[PDB]
Write a protein that holds these residues in place. Structure first.
Motif, PDB file in Angstrom:
ATOM      1  N   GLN A  91      -8.185  -2.366   0.647  1.00  0.00           N
ATOM      2  CA  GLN A  91      -7.884  -1.231   1.706  1.00  0.00           C
ATOM      3  C   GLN A  91      -8.685   0.001   1.383  1.00  0.00           C
ATOM      4  O   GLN A  91      -8.831   0.389   0.108  1.00  0.00           O
ATOM      5  CB  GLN A  91      -6.588  -0.780   1.876  1.00  0.00           C
ATOM      6  CG  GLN A  91      -6.153   0.149   3.074  1.00  0.00           C
ATOM      7  CD  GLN A  91      -4.920   1.056   2.674  1.00  0.00           C
ATOM      8  OE1 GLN A  91      -4.580   1.136   1.738  1.00  0.00           O
ATOM      9  NE2 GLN A  91      -4.618   1.403   3.892  1.00  0.00           N
ATOM     10  N   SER A 161      -8.257   1.384   7.064  1.00  0.00           N
ATOM     11  CA  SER A 161      -8.440   0.106   7.416  1.00  0.00           C
ATOM     12  C   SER A 161      -8.612  -0.776   6.254  1.00  0.00           C
ATOM     13  O   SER A 161      -8.715  -0.440   5.130  1.00  0.00           O
ATOM     14  CB  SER A 161      -9.740  -0.078   8.353  1.00  0.00           C
ATOM     15  OG  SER A 161      -9.781  -1.535   8.996  1.00  0.00           O
ATOM     16  N   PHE A 162      -8.999  -2.212   6.497  1.00  0.00           N
ATOM     17  CA  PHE A 162      -9.024  -3.155   5.328  1.00  0.00           C
ATOM     18  C   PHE A 162     -10.302  -3.784   5.395  1.00  0.00           C
ATOM     19  O   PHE A 162     -11.028  -3.915   6.598  1.00  0.00           O
ATOM     20  CB  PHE A 162      -8.193  -4.423   5.519  1.00  0.00           C
ATOM     21  CG  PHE A 162      -6.816  -3.972   4.937  1.00  0.00           C
ATOM     22  CD1 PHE A 162      -5.697  -3.435   5.665  1.00  0.00           C
ATOM     23  CD2 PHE A 162      -6.493  -4.197   3.647  1.00  0.00           C
ATOM     24  CE1 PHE A 162      -4.514  -2.972   5.145  1.00  0.00           C
ATOM     25  CE2 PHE A 162      -5.166  -3.971   3.084  1.00  0.00           C
ATOM     26  CZ  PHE A 162      -4.110  -3.160   3.940  1.00  0.00           C
ATOM     27  N   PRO A 203      -9.551  -7.590  10.407  1.00  0.00           N
ATOM     28  CA  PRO A 203      -8.190  -7.339  11.172  1.00  0.00           C
ATOM     29  C   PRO A 203      -7.069  -7.558  10.646  1.00  0.00           C
ATOM     30  O   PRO A 203      -6.783  -8.268   9.623  1.00  0.00           O
ATOM     31  CB  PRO A 203      -8.643  -8.412  12.267  1.00  0.00           C
ATOM     32  CG  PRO A 203      -9.044  -9.488  11.572  1.00  0.00           C
ATOM     33  CD  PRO A 203     -10.050  -9.041  10.469  1.00  0.00           C
ATOM     34  N   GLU A 204      -6.192  -6.700  10.657  1.00  0.00           N
ATOM     35  CA  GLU A 204      -4.844  -6.697  10.303  1.00  0.00           C
ATOM     36  C   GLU A 204      -4.043  -7.832  10.789  1.00  0.00           C
ATOM     37  O   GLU A 204      -2.857  -7.441  10.613  1.00  0.00           O
ATOM     38  CB  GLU A 204      -4.118  -5.389  10.370  1.00  0.00           C
ATOM     39  CG  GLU A 204      -4.776  -4.262   9.607  1.00  0.00           C
ATOM     40  CD  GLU A 204      -3.798  -2.962   9.565  1.00  0.00           C
ATOM     41  OE1 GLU A 204      -2.877  -2.803   9.847  1.00  0.00           O
ATOM     42  OE2 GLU A 204      -4.698  -1.891   8.990  1.00  0.00           O
ATOM     43  N   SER A 205      -4.576  -8.858  11.582  1.00  0.00           N
ATOM     44  CA  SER A 205      -4.200  -9.992  11.872  1.00  0.00           C
ATOM     45  C   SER A 205      -4.380 -11.072  10.974  1.00  0.00           C
ATOM     46  O   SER A 205      -3.852 -12.197  11.216  1.00  0.00           O
ATOM     47  CB  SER A 205      -4.372 -10.338  13.493  1.00  0.00           C
ATOM     48  OG  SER A 205      -5.680 -10.606  13.396  1.00  0.00           O
ATOM     49  N   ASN A 206      -5.313 -10.885   9.937  1.00  0.00           N
ATOM     50  CA  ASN A 206      -6.041 -11.977   9.341  1.00  0.00           C
ATOM     51  C   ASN A 206      -4.957 -12.309   8.281  1.00  0.00           C
ATOM     52  O   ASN A 206      -4.211 -11.414   7.711  1.00  0.00           O
ATOM     53  CB  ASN A 206      -7.250 -11.340   8.499  1.00  0.00           C
ATOM     54  CG  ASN A 206      -7.981 -12.554   8.202  1.00  0.00           C
ATOM     55  OD1 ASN A 206      -7.620 -13.665   8.183  1.00  0.00           O
ATOM     56  ND2 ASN A 206      -9.030 -12.424   7.204  1.00  0.00           N
ATOM     57  N   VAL A 209      -4.790 -10.574   4.953  1.00  0.00           N
ATOM     58  CA  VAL A 209      -4.367  -9.305   5.096  1.00  0.00           C
ATOM     59  C   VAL A 209      -2.745  -9.664   4.717  1.00  0.00           C
ATOM     60  O   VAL A 209      -2.245  -8.958   4.213  1.00  0.00           O
ATOM     61  CB  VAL A 209      -4.633  -8.454   6.318  1.00  0.00           C
ATOM     62  CG1 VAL A 209      -4.048  -7.196   6.098  1.00  0.00           C
ATOM     63  CG2 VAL A 209      -6.233  -8.192   6.177  1.00  0.00           C
ATOM     64  N   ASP A 210      -2.296 -10.603   5.364  1.00  0.00           N
ATOM     65  CA  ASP A 210      -0.715 -10.825   4.941  1.00  0.00           C
ATOM     66  C   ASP A 210      -0.604 -11.316   3.717  1.00  0.00           C
ATOM     67  O   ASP A 210       0.650 -10.928   3.064  1.00  0.00           O
ATOM     68  CB  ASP A 210      -0.416 -12.087   5.989  1.00  0.00           C
ATOM     69  CG  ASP A 210      -0.413 -11.945   7.556  1.00  0.00           C
ATOM     70  OD1 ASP A 210      -0.533 -10.585   7.927  1.00  0.00           O
ATOM     71  OD2 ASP A 210      -0.611 -12.641   8.106  1.00  0.00           O
ATOM     72  N   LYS A 213      -0.481  -7.996   1.645  1.00  0.00           N
ATOM     73  CA  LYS A 213       0.602  -7.264   2.093  1.00  0.00           C
ATOM     74  C   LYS A 213       1.755  -7.839   0.960  1.00  0.00           C
ATOM     75  O   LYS A 213       2.390  -7.247   0.218  1.00  0.00           O
ATOM     76  CB  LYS A 213       0.934  -7.349   3.517  1.00  0.00           C
ATOM     77  CG  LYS A 213       0.104  -6.446   4.531  1.00  0.00           C
ATOM     78  CD  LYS A 213       0.554  -6.452   5.800  1.00  0.00           C
ATOM     79  CE  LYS A 213      -0.230  -5.725   6.789  1.00  0.00           C
ATOM     80  NZ  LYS A 213      -0.068  -6.076   8.068  1.00  0.00           N
TER      81      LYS A 213
ATOM     82  N   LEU C 287       3.091   0.090   3.604  1.00  0.00           N
ATOM     83  CA  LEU C 287       1.632   0.158   3.798  1.00  0.00           C
ATOM     84  C   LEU C 287       1.463   1.286   4.762  1.00  0.00           C
ATOM     85  O   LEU C 287       0.446   1.147   5.536  1.00  0.00           O
ATOM     86  CB  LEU C 287       1.052  -1.047   4.210  1.00  0.00           C
ATOM     87  CG  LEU C 287      -0.467  -1.405   4.403  1.00  0.00           C
ATOM     88  CD1 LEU C 287      -1.028  -0.866   3.215  1.00  0.00           C
ATOM     89  CD2 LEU C 287      -0.782  -2.782   4.637  1.00  0.00           C
ATOM     90  N   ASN C 289       3.343   2.110   7.566  1.00  0.00           N
ATOM     91  CA  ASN C 289       3.826   2.180   8.679  1.00  0.00           C
ATOM     92  C   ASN C 289       5.221   2.577   8.955  1.00  0.00           C
ATOM     93  O   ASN C 289       5.484   3.161  10.085  1.00  0.00           O
ATOM     94  CB  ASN C 289       3.697   0.740   9.129  1.00  0.00           C
ATOM     95  CG  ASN C 289       2.240  -0.145   9.145  1.00  0.00           C
ATOM     96  OD1 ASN C 289       1.606   0.113  10.097  1.00  0.00           O
ATOM     97  ND2 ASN C 289       1.688  -0.345   7.948  1.00  0.00           N
TER      98      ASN C 289
END
Ligand SMILES: [Zn+2]
Lengths: 239, 361, 576
Positions: A91, A161-162, A203-206, A209-210, A213, C287, C289
């Motif tokens: 990030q 962003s990532f 994208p933070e749907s990838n 990225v999960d 996190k 993060l 949010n």
DNA sequence: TTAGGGTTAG
């Protein structure tokens, strides 16, 4: 990522010295999907609205199986090697520059680099970023220097962003500004896309990225790290 | 008695072999001494070396280096070799300053009370920690530590008397051996049929023998002359492999033996047991296990908190450990030896793995 | 049942008081019919939860008030319904359909956001408190009857005709806390009896499904004029046999490295709560949010299961979005979690975490006075038995020798050594010049049947050396001069090893003291196994050891020596 | 049109 599965329709084929190649034609359409077995098929496309079919999704599954066991890498910052390359993913904490053929990007992974990262002699006024999420965890953050063509990309970026830094260069450092010894790690991205040097916003749907996190969930609760925010009168929670 | 005849050398899989045992004095004589090695004894299979016994003293023979105290506890009697100790480097009694006076005084309190615990007279209760020895055909105890039991009443004796049957029935009476017994059982023992396999077995036996002899360094020829190692190496496999030079069976086979010895020591280098210091020699090797010097150095570089960083580091990282070692000593320090020493250190409690790749001391 | 938070509140002149019912011991309150009434309670408990946020520099100041920064105080009650009396306010004074369903489980109450209602008004929803439930109908819909509800319409043949998601937001949140899994509930709806009233919602006139519930063709969002009722008739008891059934797991499903507790749940028996400071020392607020830091919390459930002779301890964390905790999470409580998220750290410790999937429930309140069960008394060899063995215990062992020993004066502000306040970080990371004593020690113990190494921390050392506290404090006064003192002893009866120096008279004093029988005494130790029972630490084969003493060198197989953490040092009967 | 995959030297 390499191993993604792509579908191109009304792809117009062209030739160059008998070297055939496709191009985004007039009337073109497309789809793309994740490469992992043991997970759903989720479409990733920008073309017109589409209808998926069992033959189509079974082509995706068959290509997954194929790449996986008929044709046949992950790396935390804390597992790197002194001078090499890698397709890092992080990030963006901030971005800056000093006048020249280069541009700075500051990022973090939540793991400790073996040696401390190289630290730039930046004109601090140029840096975009928030100090709250940085200072008292700076030991878990690094710096990267991109060059030439990557400058206009990096310059155009926005913090927060990532990213995935394809073919990020690592390089060993051993000195300080006054030329006292200190072992350290450098990071660079050379101009030109040859070999695949580049960046793509993630994208933070990838699911990667999960995963990142998920990782930080342990890096903070089960951190085992020493104190910070000694000013315990500061938070006031939802003040 | 097979079950009684527990695996050879009586391995410490059964924990008691490392800790002072608590048997009836009368039973201490009924046990056998191990026919495999002297200085160790057997009871119900469990091997014993360190013994704990408490009773009353009944006779004395005083000598220049040791006392010899006869001791009874109800069931039986024995005699105990209680090595003495002198007060060399005598601590004087002076009117030192507050702190020094207090230190000296407390030291004197401790010393005098230790004497009172050490000195002894017949009929008193005595405790002894030590091991079984035999002399003049007679069995005895050589005590590691002994002190006067300061009890005014038989209560603690009573406790021990009530206890011993309990611990017997719980622990010592248990003969069984729960080991899986994963024995190779001499498969291809007289011949490996494979020079790499022969080299592996050779390295096994050779490192075994070196750790046995505690040799810290050695020229490879010194090892190549060992009787057992030679016998292991010169099995018909190497003679058949080197037989292509029929006209020089002896010479070719001896050269192949030297080469496979080289191969074994090289396997040890690969596995980090031994290494060739920067000695300028071609076949001189130093064994890591005995390399107390490197142990000390790498223990310095973190035991004293990592010296390069200003920040309050808890230890150091594998890579920076290796790098600072190569910086301060020699770049040629292989990672294999570094891994071996890092293992041995935490075995010794000289380093601890808070995680993988980062360590403290 | 209050509209804002669901939480059953008691309200009467001058204000209100939150409460926490329980139908009967280990069973939850279950019929909405009980809202509105009067409850007279006299065998009840009143709680508090002081949330102080002081800022004391050192222990000294604890004697004074001038350092507290803030204060608050939760307060509420709790009681069974076997004790209190329910009174139905006699209704002050001077056309529908219904269906039964069994319910599978509950998503937790959270301010989700929502989809475009399927094929309906595409206005973009904002976040709003919401939840939904999963269940399956029983019998067809039933009409207004006066005697209850008429005969079921012809029951649907397909599973879609029975399985159903139940969605809730807006005022109907008031029907939350009555809902509990497995039972058969009865929903009622007034108005003109008509088909379709409940049977479908995949694409509809309106229904703002949450994102996680998109695409489900069995949804159903209730209308404010509908409401629920509990089913209990003996003619349906044979369905209510869910009695004596709970969402519970096998401890090997736990304690193993694979899935993340979307699969599993477990009774529990809490033991503490404090704040998750290391998260605020690494402030990152989901993060970035969540926003502002509603500090995160940790618990230490002593897991329960019939499968095992001992309860493995197994921390649980609560992060910002789920603060403040539910009601009734207190030392001693017996709690039955559901669908946590399980994460195993790189540093290798199993730990569980809160997510919208997980919802508390209480099974019993604390006991009146805290009981005292004494830790078992055992022999060290039992921890080498090979099978399962107790978790924590006491043993009548005997010091044999001292390995390592270090003393430090450290700054209370920063995690570094500090000579009497003149901190290395003084002026930089450390503002205040102040220091405190800290000490560490490692023993070797035996008990007549096994070896073990015990590490012992903090003041305890004063009991390991057997020093009376006063004299120990005097000594520490001395060591304060060098500030740091380290000794390493080559072994039993041997001189200080290379890692320490011998010149100081004080050093000789210590060394002797560490070699006197007056130290090497017997002691009753109680301890905690340093590595908890789980798969997380892999097994290893035996090492090879080659002794050298007595007569000849012994070569042997040996396991790795125990490591144990100290908890209690106490002499026995003054055994010299 | 361009580019039309493969290591910078920062
Ligand atoms: Zn400080």
């Amino acid at each position: 990522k390499n191993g993604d599965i792509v579908r191109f329709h009304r792809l117009k084929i062209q030739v160059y010295k008998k070297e055939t190649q496709g191009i985004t034609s007039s009337g073109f359409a497309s789809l793309t999907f994740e490469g992992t077995l043991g997970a759903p098929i989720i479409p990733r496309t920008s073309s017109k609205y589409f209808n998926f079919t069992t033959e189509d999704h079974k082509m995706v599954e068959a290509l997954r199986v194929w790449a996986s066991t008929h044709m046949s890498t992950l790396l935390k910052l804390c597992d790197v090697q002194p001078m090499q390359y890698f397709d890092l993913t992080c990030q963006l904490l901030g971005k800056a520059e000093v006048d020249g053929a280069s541009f700075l990007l500051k990022v973090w992974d939540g793991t400790r680099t073996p040696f401390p990262s190289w630290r730039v002699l930046i004109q601090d006024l140029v840096l975009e970023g928030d100090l709250s999420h940085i200072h008292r965890l700076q030991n878990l953050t690094i710096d990267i220097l991109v060059y030439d063509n990557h400058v206009h990309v990096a310059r155009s970026l926005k913090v927060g962003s990532f990213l995935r830094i394809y073919s990020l260069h690592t390089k060993l450092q051993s000195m300080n500004s006054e030329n006292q010894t200190m072992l350290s790690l450098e990071f660079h991205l050379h101009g030109g896309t040859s070999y695949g040097r580049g960046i793509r916003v993630l994208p933070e749907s990838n699911s990667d990225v999960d995963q990142l996190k998920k990782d930080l969930e342990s890096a903070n609760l089960t951190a085992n790290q020493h104190s910070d925010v000694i000013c315990q009168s500061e938070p006031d929670d939802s003040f | 008695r097979c079950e009684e005849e527990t695996p050879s050398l009586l391995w410490g899989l059964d924990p008691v072999f490392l800790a002072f045992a608590k048997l009836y004095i009368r039973d201490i004589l009924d046990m056998k001494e191990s026919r495999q090695v002297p200085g160790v004894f057997l009871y119900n299979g469990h091997p014993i070396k360190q013994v704990d016994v408490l009773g009353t003293v009944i006779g004395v023979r005083e000598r220049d280096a040791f006392y010899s105290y006869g001791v009874d506890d109800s069931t039986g009697v024995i005699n105990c070799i209680c090595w003495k100790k002198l007060n060399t480097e005598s601590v004087s009694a002076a009117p030192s300053a507050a702190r020094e006076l207090s230190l000296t005084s407390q030291l004197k309190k401790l010393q005098e009370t230790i004497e009172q615990k050490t000195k002894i007279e017949i009929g008193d209760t005595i405790r002894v920690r030590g091991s079984i020895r035999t002399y003049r055909e007679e069995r005895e105890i050589h005590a590691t530590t002994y002190y006067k039991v300061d009890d005014p009443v038989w209560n603690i004796q009573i406790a021990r008397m009530l206890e011993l049957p309990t611990i017997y029935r719980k622990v010592y009476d248990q003969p069984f051996h729960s080991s899986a017994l994963e024995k190779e059982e001499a498969l291809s023992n007289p011949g490996a049929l494979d020079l790499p396999s022969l080299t592996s077995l050779l390295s096994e036996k050779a490192k075994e023998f070196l750790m046995e002899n505690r040799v810290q360094s050695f020229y490879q020829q010194e090892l190549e002359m060992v009787e057992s190692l030679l016998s292991l190496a010169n099995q018909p496999v190497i003679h058949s492999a080197s037989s292509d030079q029929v006209n020089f069976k002896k010479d070719t086979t001896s050269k192949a033996i030297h080469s496979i010895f080289k191969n074994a020591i090289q396997l040890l280098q690969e596995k980090g047991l031994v290494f060739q210091k920067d000695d300028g020699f071609d076949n001189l090797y130093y064994v890591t296990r005995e390399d107390k010097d490197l142990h000390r150095k790498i223990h310095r570089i973190i035991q004293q908190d990592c010296q390069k960083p200003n920040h309050m580091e808890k230890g150091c990282h594998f890579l920076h450990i290796l790098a600072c070692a190569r910086l301060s000593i020699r770049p040629g320090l292989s990672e294999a030896v570094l891994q071996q020493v890092l293992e041995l250190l935490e075995d010794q409690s000289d380093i601890v793995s808070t995680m993988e790749h980062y360590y403290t001391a | 049942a209050s509209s804002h938070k669901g939480c059953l509140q008691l309200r009467d002149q001058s204000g209100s008081l939150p409460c926490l019912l329980l139908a009967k011991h280990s069973q939850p309150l279950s019929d909405p019919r009980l809202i509105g009434c009067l409850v007279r309670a006299e065998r009840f408990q009143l709680i508090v939860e002081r949330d102080v946020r002081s800022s004391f520099p050192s222990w000294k100041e604890l004697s004074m008030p001038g350092f507290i920064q803030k204060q608050q105080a939760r307060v509420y009650v709790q009681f069974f319904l076997a004790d209190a009396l329910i009174l139905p306010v006699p209704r002050p004074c001077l056309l529908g359909q219904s269906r039964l369903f069994l319910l599978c489980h509950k998503e937790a109450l959270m301010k989700r956001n929502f989809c475009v209602p399927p094929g309906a008004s595409p206005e973009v929803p904002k976040p709003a408190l919401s939840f939904y439930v999963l269940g399956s109908w029983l019998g067809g819909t039933q009409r207004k009857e006066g005697t209850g509800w008429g005969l079921p319409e012809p029951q649907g043949n397909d599973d879609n005709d029975q399985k159903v998601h139940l969605i809730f937001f807006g005022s109907s949140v008031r029907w939350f806390e009555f809902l509990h899994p497995g039972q058969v509930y009865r929903l009622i709806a007034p108005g003109p009896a008509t088909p379709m009233l409940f049977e479908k919602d995949g694409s509809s006139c309106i229904s703002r499904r949450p994102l996680e519930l998109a695409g489900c063709a069995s949804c159903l969002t209730v209308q404010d004029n509908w409401t629920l009722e509990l089913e209990s008739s003996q003619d349906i008891q044979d369905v209510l046999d869910a009695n004596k059934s709970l969402p519970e797991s096998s401890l090997t499903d736990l304690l193993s490295d694979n899935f993340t507790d979307s699969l599993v749940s477990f009774s529990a028996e809490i033991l503490s709560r404090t704040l998750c400071e290391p998260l605020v020392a690494s402030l990152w607020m989901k993060l970035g949010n969540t926003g502002a830091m509603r500090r995160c919390v940790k618990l230490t459930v002593a897991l329960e299961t019939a499968e095992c002779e001992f309860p493995p301890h197994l921390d649980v964390y609560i992060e910002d979005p789920h603060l403040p905790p539910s009601l009734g999470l207190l030392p001693g409580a017996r709690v039955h979690f559901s669908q946590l998220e399980k994460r195993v750290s790189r540093s290798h410790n199993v730990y569980c975490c809160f997510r919208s999937s997980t919802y508390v429930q209480v099974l019993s309140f604390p006991p009146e006075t805290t009981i005292s069960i004494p830790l078992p008394h055992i022999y060290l060899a039992e921890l080498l038995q090979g099978g399962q063995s107790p978790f924590q215990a006491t043993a009548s062992c005997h010091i044999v020798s001292v390995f390592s020993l270090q003393l430090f004066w450290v700054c209370a502000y920063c995690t570094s050594i500090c000579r009497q306040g003149k901190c290395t970080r003084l002026g930089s990371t450390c503002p205040t010049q102040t220091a405190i004593s800290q000490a560490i020690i490692r023993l070797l113990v035996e008990d007549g049947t096994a070896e073990a190494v015990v590490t012992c921390r903090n003041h305890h050392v004063a009991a390991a050396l057997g020093l009376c506290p006063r004299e120990w404090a005097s000594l520490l006064d001395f060591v304060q001069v060098p500030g740091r003192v380290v000794l390493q002893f080559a072994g039993p009866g041997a001189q200080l090893e290379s890692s320490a120096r011998v010149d100081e008279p004080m050093t000789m004093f210590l060394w002797t003291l560490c070699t006197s029988p007056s130290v090497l005494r017997p002691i009753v130790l109680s301890f905690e196994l340093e590595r908890k029972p789980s798969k997380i630490v892999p097994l290893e084969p035996p090492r090879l050891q080659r002794f050298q003493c007595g007569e000849l060198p012994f070569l042997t197989h040996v396991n790795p020596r125990l490591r144990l953490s100290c908890l209690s040092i106490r002499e026995s009967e003054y055994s010299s």
